[PDB]
Enzyme design. Structure first.
Site, PDB file in Angstrom:
ATOM      1  N   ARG A  88     -62.836  38.259  63.616  1.00 12.95           N
ATOM      2  CA  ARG A  88     -61.452  37.239  64.462  1.00 12.95           C
ATOM      3  C   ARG A  88     -62.047  36.235  65.505  1.00 12.95           C
ATOM      4  O   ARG A  88     -61.284  35.557  65.914  1.00 12.95           O
ATOM      5  CB  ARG A  88     -60.618  38.505  65.006  1.00 12.95           C
ATOM      6  CG  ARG A  88     -59.030  38.021  64.984  1.00 12.95           C
ATOM      7  CD  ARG A  88     -58.139  39.194  65.318  1.00 12.95           C
ATOM      8  NE  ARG A  88     -58.416  39.583  66.808  1.00 12.95           N
ATOM      9  CZ  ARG A  88     -59.035  40.696  67.145  1.00 12.95           C
ATOM     10  NH1 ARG A  88     -59.286  41.504  66.322  1.00 12.95           N
ATOM     11  NH2 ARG A  88     -59.014  41.114  68.392  1.00 12.95           N
ATOM     12  N   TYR A 126     -41.690  18.823  55.867  1.00 11.58           N
ATOM     13  CA  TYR A 126     -41.649  19.901  54.894  1.00 11.58           C
ATOM     14  C   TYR A 126     -40.601  21.233  55.554  1.00 11.58           C
ATOM     15  O   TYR A 126     -40.623  21.095  56.575  1.00 11.58           O
ATOM     16  CB  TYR A 126     -43.004  20.494  54.647  1.00 11.58           C
ATOM     17  CG  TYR A 126     -43.198  21.790  54.101  1.00 11.58           C
ATOM     18  CD1 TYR A 126     -42.519  22.218  52.975  1.00 11.58           C
ATOM     19  CD2 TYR A 126     -43.705  22.838  55.134  1.00 11.58           C
ATOM     20  CE1 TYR A 126     -42.782  23.565  52.414  1.00 11.58           C
ATOM     21  CE2 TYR A 126     -43.805  24.218  54.640  1.00 11.58           C
ATOM     22  CZ  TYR A 126     -43.051  24.676  53.368  1.00 11.58           C
ATOM     23  OH  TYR A 126     -43.316  26.050  52.856  1.00 11.58           O
ATOM     24  N   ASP A 158     -49.205  15.639  59.887  1.00 10.85           N
ATOM     25  CA  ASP A 158     -49.502  16.243  58.652  1.00 10.85           C
ATOM     26  C   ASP A 158     -49.887  15.281  57.316  1.00 10.85           C
ATOM     27  O   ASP A 158     -49.055  14.436  56.818  1.00 10.85           O
ATOM     28  CB  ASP A 158     -48.048  17.095  58.296  1.00 10.85           C
ATOM     29  CG  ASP A 158     -48.164  18.126  57.411  1.00 10.85           C
ATOM     30  OD1 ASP A 158     -49.414  18.439  56.593  1.00 10.85           O
ATOM     31  OD2 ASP A 158     -47.635  19.379  57.315  1.00 10.85           O
ATOM     32  N   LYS A 215     -53.086  22.838  48.980  1.00  8.33           N
ATOM     33  CA  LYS A 215     -52.733  21.998  47.833  1.00  8.33           C
ATOM     34  C   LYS A 215     -53.676  20.877  48.270  1.00  8.33           C
ATOM     35  O   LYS A 215     -54.190  20.465  49.441  1.00  8.33           O
ATOM     36  CB  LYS A 215     -51.360  21.313  48.149  1.00  8.33           C
ATOM     37  CG  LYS A 215     -50.821  21.039  49.301  1.00  8.33           C
ATOM     38  CD  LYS A 215     -49.549  21.785  49.647  1.00  8.33           C
ATOM     39  CE  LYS A 215     -49.442  23.344  49.363  1.00  8.33           C
ATOM     40  NZ  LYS A 215     -48.581  23.576  47.957  1.00  8.33           N
TER      41      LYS A 215
HETATM   42  C1  LIG Z   1     -41.614  26.957  49.589  1.00 11.34           C
HETATM   43  C2  LIG Z   1     -43.124  26.942  49.192  1.00 11.34           C
HETATM   44  C3  LIG Z   1     -43.940  25.674  48.712  1.00 11.34           C
HETATM   45  C4  LIG Z   1     -44.708  25.001  49.936  1.00 11.34           C
HETATM   46  C5  LIG Z   1     -45.375  23.601  49.673  1.00 11.34           C
HETATM   47  N1  LIG Z   1     -46.108  22.977  50.474  1.00 11.34           N
HETATM   48  C6  LIG Z   1     -46.227  23.632  51.733  1.00 11.34           C
HETATM   49  C7  LIG Z   1     -46.401  22.433  53.162  1.00 11.34           C
HETATM   50  C8  LIG Z   1     -46.919  23.099  54.153  1.00 11.34           C
HETATM   51  C9  LIG Z   1     -47.599  24.347  54.728  1.00 11.34           C
HETATM   52  O1  LIG Z   1     -48.549  24.992  54.027  1.00 11.34           O
HETATM   53  P1  LIG Z   1     -48.659  26.520  53.304  1.00 11.34           P
HETATM   54  O2  LIG Z   1     -47.817  26.354  52.302  1.00 11.34           O
HETATM   55  O3  LIG Z   1     -50.212  26.621  52.835  1.00 11.34           O
HETATM   56  O4  LIG Z   1     -48.370  27.273  54.486  1.00 11.34           O
HETATM   57  C10 LIG Z   1     -47.371  21.971  55.309  1.00 11.34           C
HETATM   58  N2  LIG Z   1     -47.398  20.857  55.247  1.00 11.34           N
HETATM   59  C11 LIG Z   1     -46.745  20.372  53.977  1.00 11.34           C
HETATM   60  C12 LIG Z   1     -46.668  18.707  53.824  1.00 11.34           C
HETATM   61  C13 LIG Z   1     -46.522  21.118  52.917  1.00 11.34           C
HETATM   62  O5  LIG Z   1     -46.017  20.463  51.819  1.00 11.34           O
HETATM   63  C14 LIG Z   1     -44.330  22.475  48.949  1.00 11.34           C
HETATM   64  O6  LIG Z   1     -44.136  22.753  47.714  1.00 11.34           O
HETATM   65  O7  LIG Z   1     -43.785  21.747  49.770  1.00 11.34           O
HETATM   66  C1  LIG Z   2     -62.595  40.956  68.919  1.00 13.77           C
HETATM   67  C2  LIG Z   2     -63.576  42.365  69.098  1.00 13.77           C
HETATM   68  C3  LIG Z   2     -63.404  43.441  68.016  1.00 13.77           C
HETATM   69  C4  LIG Z   2     -63.379  44.741  68.844  1.00 13.77           C
HETATM   70  C5  LIG Z   2     -63.549  45.907  67.631  1.00 13.77           C
HETATM   71  N1  LIG Z   2     -62.344  45.897  67.083  1.00 13.77           N
HETATM   72  C6  LIG Z   2     -63.495  47.215  68.658  1.00 13.77           C
HETATM   73  O1  LIG Z   2     -62.953  48.181  68.070  1.00 13.77           O
HETATM   74  O2  LIG Z   2     -63.866  47.377  69.634  1.00 13.77           O
END
Ligand SMILES: CCCC[C@H](NCc1c(COP(=O)(O)O)cnc(C)c1O)C(=O)O
Ligand SMILES: CCCC[C@H](N)C(=O)O
Ligand SMILES: CCCC[C@H](N)C(=O)O
Ligand SMILES: CCCC[C@H](N)C(=O)O
Lengths: 386, 388, 388, 383
Positions: C64, C118, C183, C208
């Protein structure tokens, strides 16, 4: 050497990862591996093509010559079986194929084998596809069956499906100078270590127990440096390779092997005794609650009864077929060593041409990690559905 | 069938996915496959163990008998090569191993083969590990080398590394009743389709071009239903299986195969004429140029020059060694067909422990052209040539 | 540095692999990363938790906080967009979520945005879930909509679905001191680089085109070091992480981005002109087509027309619904940038959560052009149009 | 006819696989999912965007709306925790983020929480990044801290790192009408089921124990249909999704969870007693140890002591620093629940109500009890 087997299963093949600042080995999908210069590249290619292990710091050159993730899985099992080296392949049958081709290439195409073997291993020897000749012999008749042409003595204990045990100390003595290959798939390095009894090669279908989740095919032979080189020479030109993600999951499974085997073993030991009380079952094959262990092998050779059970039923084929079809929780499928309990009729799946064909009333049962009460309730319901 | 090859590369082996409401095929890692009953389970086991393809609705029983992701990749390539069926394995050498064992099992252990072949394929035939006997013959001497126990006629064009071409129409005529196995790794189904010329089996090292990203080992033979059963009979008991994720990435790579091959082929055609002008290089071997191709095979057999280039240097081993080591952008490594451009000295790596006749010239350098810009690739190769 | 964008797509984010003797980056699934000692471990924890990039030789501590495979993908896109750094997340919406939360946390919850966006991005701003207030403004009314607490100006060109273009040079001038978020999902770094026009952040739905095979969800923002630190601060505590295999496939896809985009663009340019001749279609929207770009943006802002085509039908909803349902080769599904051609009715699927006033026309149909042959795609679309 | 928890761990979320002729669930990497027609496609889109579960036979439409492999993992954990439904995310912090944003969206941004919590969960509440206000309260002062706009009561037992236990029956009574979120990462559904005690939401950092091999990040909340719908509403537009292979490995890990937890618990119970005899350690914290649970929670709430051990050293920071650096077999790293034994200094890694400098957290793996003892004694003697 000083660490217990339970510790070796967790940290085996994990050397240098803590120093590199990582927790688990990475999956390197690379097909090719670049070289530093022409001189070291050419030396490393010839070194690996002739079956030698990779030197530290040297380039792997190509995946068919060497892969790091597979090598980590190989060193992990070799430490458990007390073997010098190990060679991994795509499936357990690929390992058997390479073992037989190595013997044929060395001018020893004849094989001495005990009849109670895995169906595929038996069919591969009978067909003689890899230029092999076979003499089927019993435990006492191994020495007589040895020819000046024998390259290997193949044994499996507990046998698939009957679970017949074989004295490994007597087999090695009978073979003498001939190497002995012991299929230790069912026992696993937790219960049995044939190398300690004098065996030369130890085959494991990693697909079962080593993986433990029914999602990674694999095969591996723990053996001395001479046979490891011969097996790698075959692997480099035949190419039955274990995929890096497959090797990752089999190595991952080895960490929980001791914990999973002991849990399934406890459930199997209880189930074998509970099923014996049912009137529909005539016999329960289990090394722990045995009808064929007068030699005291459970203690000397095996440290546990295992997680496999064979059951003979009182109606023959019809009762065996009905029992398999009426199971709901227990799944009717081939294979073993997984987290779930599977069941099969070996005569129809493991059926057309055999001398050592098992009985029609016999049913093989791979015990998983489910509760003992829930498994007996399902098996009793299937037996009563007759 | 009524679709162009570019469309077939995208939608090949993708039948029923749109109906199931999914976009790409799922990766089923299952080792075992449950059965409905003992009768159907046992029958499905025997059909797949005897090398039969999986009938629709029946259970796969076990992964060593059948796998759905591998089967999708198999049907995708078969449609491209115009073959009835295809059988996939762990590596290109596993496919060769199974094809030779299939011939040995059928009572035909003798193989007739033309000498310019891939090192591993050549070594596997010479050793006779799989109970095979070989008679090395030239293109014209194939008919004479045919014995009463011949199982296959092995040919590869363009050859690895020299890129020597073979007239497949004349080879099939010379073989007659003997089936011809053609290794089509270098040309791919985009440029060449040996089945159309009368070949029975077509081997491909999926590791190169079909994968295209240097991250998926594989081997596959597009062939008639007869050899497909023999290959699956061997696969079921020898078990050199292609992993489901490996099959997924090779099938995934087929979608972009026509687009990647045409892009690398364009860069290769331009680099062949640019490198020819350099004084350090004596000769440039490239199928796209009709010079060393007097039979007119580029047009009849191959629809393109390819993305592989062999170069003969004027200093022999020393110049070849220096040119390889001074490359920075172009990586010195074995293998081909990837996005990265690679370079190798065959006489110093793959064919260094090989006999004088079978090994290529000590000045020959093989080069796999990738998807980098033509100006950045020539600048790096010229810098490496000038460094000696 | 002096390399072409085509070379940079193949070798971008691949530094040190050739020196380590490997071809492609390894997939490290490790959740935790061991430390050498308490002092260095604690300092590297504090360094990454406060949004800083990983120092060479230091431990990643936890996934993370940092992951190497994701970092490789991040450096690969940053070089293509000419940005200092980049931050990757699980989806394009997770990147948008982090960008808005970074602005809210900095005491700037107000966002100025152009209406053609979008559906998801539009709905996220309208709801005000992340403590955001929005003022919808046109290209000319951006400067007036700027409030004292404005965090960033959100723009998208070509817009989803209509494909409306936005002059980015005039937008940056209107925004002045407030950063601009563009975007660039549809154009990709191949066609447009908003950073060179003065934009601060560039969002891409890696799902995409960057992936290109419809099998890897992802989101990434190429931006300066200040916003990259703010985005990583939000990522370390919100945890919308990109999985190592997802990052591997998106980085793998970047190697073939230029080749795939140019191939789909050529097919789209021809399809837009062929579909315009059909009487059932009233208007065809495509940047590289007559009467669609009076400001001369195609040349100074975009180096190509793209691979998306929106079109109005002469029967409204009924004709649009029939055309979608009668397609066989072209698949009716949401999403774009894949190897196969997809079709949709935006009012019923993508732009369904959008307010009725900002919803697109009922006769409008969006079409993502894949890598199939141009003739096979027109035959299928003409058959679907004639079926009504 | 009811199945035991050990059986449910193996066959949970595996429905219809045997009928389809497959052993394990397939990994469907598909980002988009085709639809039959505009009418059903649009209705399925709205159904999933508004947080509803997927109807059988209907198309998933898009991965941000639904994914089948994730759904199988979700149904598997919900059955173990006795919850109606479950919602999975990329990490445990993504689940916490969505749980807090769902509360804020419902007009309840205030959260009542006990001070001994995971560092990240504590920092996320203190910062107020997601528009949240927090009132830190003790077990007895929960009822008083409840405000008119309280959305959740966040509790964690055993606490990270000290392993302090919380009586969940009294917490639910104090909260009353306010739903209670319990972070059951350390105990897992093997030892504790907060839903049975009256909790509304149960969060698990799937990264630990559910995965069990330190190779799959994840987060999941087992809860009723109302909160699951709200959590899926946030997931559909924020998109902190669990990758299909990540969901596959977490679901795979649940099959061996009961067997791994019991093995590590046996080793931890023996190690806690063996390390107590060493003079360098002043106190060993472990639920199973005597004089560490006066309310009788071991038996009523927890069916086991767990696999985590925190301990105070007699030299403070210097002894704690030396002890973790001299470990060879036991690896000095953050995280827990894996197959290998990990050790850390909670003060340095992971001045806000910090644990003691002499305190050391130790996650017990699946290694032999004697080999772990020998390595830890060697590290203590090296000071
Ligand atoms: C409704 C689900 C389909 C989403 C698809 N595109 C999603 C999309 C996103 C967000 O990205 P994620 O989907 O990876 O979170 C951001 N930006 C644009 C221009 C998009 O077209 C579309 O056909 O526009
Ligand atoms: C981001 C640090 C992660 C810490 C870990 N999850 C813990 O149990 O100590
Ligand atoms: C190909 C049949 C698989 C049989 C399986 N390996 C078993 O031993 O049950
Ligand atoms: C083991 C050598 C493999 C190299 C690869 N077959 C090539 O053609 O370069």
């Amino acid at each position: 050497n000083s660490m217990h087997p339970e510790t070796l299963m967790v940290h085996g093949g994990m050397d240098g990862l803590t120093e590199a600042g990582v927790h688990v080995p990475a999956i390197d999908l690379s097909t090719t591996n670049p070289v530093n210069d022409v001189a070291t590249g050419g030396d490393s290619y010839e070194w690996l093509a002739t079956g030698h292990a990779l030197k530290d710091g040297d380039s792997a050159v190509y995946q068919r010559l060497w892969q790091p993730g597979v090598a980590r899985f190989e060193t992990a099992l070799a430490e458990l079986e007390h073997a010098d080296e190990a060679v991994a392949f795509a499936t357990g049958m690929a390992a058997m194929t390479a073992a037989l081709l190595a013997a044929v290439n060395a001018g020893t195409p004849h094989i001495v084998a005990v009849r109670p073997l895995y169906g595929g291993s038996d069919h591969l020897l009978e067909t003689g596809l890899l230029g092999t000749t076979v003499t089927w012999a019993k435990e006492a008749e191994i020495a007589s069956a040895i020819q000046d042409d024998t390259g290997l003595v193949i044994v499996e204990t507990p046998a698939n499906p009957s679970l017949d045990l074989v004295d490994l100390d007597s087999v090695v003595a009978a073979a003498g100078t001939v190497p002995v290959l012991v299929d230790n798939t069912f026992c696993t390095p937790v219960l049995q270590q044939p190398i300690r009894h004098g065996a030369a090669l130890v085959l494991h279908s990693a697909t079962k127990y080593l993986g433990g989740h029914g999602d990674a095919m694999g095969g591996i032979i723990a053996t001395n440096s001479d046979w490891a080189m011969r097996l790698r020479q075959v692997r480099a030109i035949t190419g039955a390779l274990l995929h890096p993600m497959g090797a990752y999951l089999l190595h991952r499974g080895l960490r929980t092997l001791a914990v999973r085997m002991r849990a399934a073993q406890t459930t199997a030991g209880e189930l074998a005794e509970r099923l014996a009380a049912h009137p529909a079952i005539t016999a329960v094959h289990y090394p722990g609650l045995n009808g064929q262990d007068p030699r005291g092998l459970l203690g000397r050779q095996m440290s546990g009864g295992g997680a496999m059970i064979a059951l003979e039923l009182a109606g023959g084929f019809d009762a065996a077929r009905s029992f398999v079809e009426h199971c709901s929780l227990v799944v009717h499928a081939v294979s073993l060593g997984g987290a779930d309990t599977l069941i099969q009729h070996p005569a129809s799946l493991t059926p057309v041409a055999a001398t050592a064909k098992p009985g029609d009333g016999l049913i093989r049962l791979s015990v998983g990690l489910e509760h003992v009460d829930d498994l007996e309730d399902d098996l009793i319901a299937a037996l009563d559905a007759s």
